[PDB]
Amino acid sequence: SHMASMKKKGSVVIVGRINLSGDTAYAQQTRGEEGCQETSQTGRDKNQVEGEVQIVSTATQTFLATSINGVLWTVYHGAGTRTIASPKGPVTQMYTNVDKDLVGWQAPQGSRSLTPCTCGSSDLYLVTRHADVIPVRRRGDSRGSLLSPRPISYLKGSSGGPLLCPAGHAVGIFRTAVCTRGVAKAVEFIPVESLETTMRS
Ligand SMILES: [Zn+2]
C-alpha cells in the first residue's frame, strides 16, 4: 500500500530577507522553525513580503532567492522543482533549468526587483545570507574572485543571492563557491544576461 502512503515534498518557504533598504545591510528573520514547517506543508504563506533578497528554506536546506525584473530567482540545487508558498497557496515555478542551476517564480507581491546591469563593470559585491557584502572582482562570464578569501562556512547557504554592480544593478546569481583547502578564493555565478534570455524564450 505504498501509493496511499507516498509523501509530497513541501514548498519553499520565505523565512527572512536581506535588508538593503538603508545604509546598513542586515538579515531579518520573518518565520521561525515551527511556522516554516507548517507553511511548507500547506504552501499557504500569509506573511507580507518585502525587499529584493529573500531567505528561503526547505525541510533540508536554507539559502537565498533574488527578485530581478519581476521574477524571484534561485538555484535548482537548492529548490529543485518545488513550489513556493504564497498567500494564495503553492505557486508553481515559472522557470526551471537544471542545466543552468536556475529556477524562478513570479516575484511575490510586495517584493522589489533589482534591475539587470548594463554597465559592463567588473567590480562586484556579493550579498551573503548573513548580510555581509563581499567585494568580488569579476574574472570571466560566470566567475569572480574574492578580494579576501574566507572559509567555506562563511558562504554556506548564500546560493541564490546576488552579485551587484557599483550602481546596485544585478550582475548575477550566486551559484557555488570555488574552494581549495576548504577556503573560498572564488565564486561561480549565473550571469544576469542568462536570466534575461530565460525570461524571453
Ligand atoms: Zn551596473
TrEMBL record:
Entry's localization field: Host cell; Host membrane; Virion membrane
Domain of life: Viruses
PROSITE patterns: HV_PV_NS3_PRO (PS51822)
Pfam assignment, any one: Peptidase_S29
Keywords in alphabetical order: Capsid protein, Glycoprotein, Host membrane, Host-virus interaction, Hydrolase, Membrane, Metal-binding, Protease, Transmembrane, Transmembrane helix, Viral attachment to host cell, Virion, Virus entry into host cell, Zinc
Gene3D superfamilies linked: 2.40.10.120
Segments passing through the bilayer: none
All residue ranges annotated as the Peptidase S29 domain in the record: 24-201
Residues noted as binding Zn(2+) in the record, renumbered to the chain: C117, C119, C165, H169
GO molecular function, one term: metal ion binding
Signal peptide: none
GO cellular component: host cell; host cell membrane; viral capsid; virion membrane
Principal subcellular localization: host cell
Catalytic activity: ATP + H2O = ADP + phosphate + H(+)
Protein name per UniProt: NS3 protease
Organism: Hepacivirus hominis
Lineage, opening ranks: Viruses, Riboviria, Orthornavirae, Kitrinoviricota, Flasuviricetes
